[PDB]
Symmetry: C2
Amino acid sequence: SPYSSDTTPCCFAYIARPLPRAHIKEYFYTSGKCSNPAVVFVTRKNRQVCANPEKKWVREYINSLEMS
Amino acid sequence: SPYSSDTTPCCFAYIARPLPRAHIKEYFYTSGKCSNPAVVFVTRKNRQVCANPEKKWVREYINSLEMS
């Protein structure tokens, strides 16, 4: 191993309500050292949220962020 | 469950070298949704590090932080 001496962002919950696209700084996926793979929406307040890719608005932000 | 819709800080690595007590803002333990329970030293740069309680300097910071 290289040097993964840091905590791992593992999200297991899934907020049913969507978040404000005006406060979603950046998100990212998480898995491997987690019970299940899920998305993580981080706002500008360093607030990490858990979102499942099986929603209709979750993949909406992931698609609006990773544009072409 | 209440509302744990956030990522979980799970540390599995253990830095062999100690950290600078002049940059250790605050630390905390982590477990439950993690493969193993470990400590987490967070500096002022929002840098989360993993430290095991089986070291000689790790419990040193945890004891110097949770004074009486």
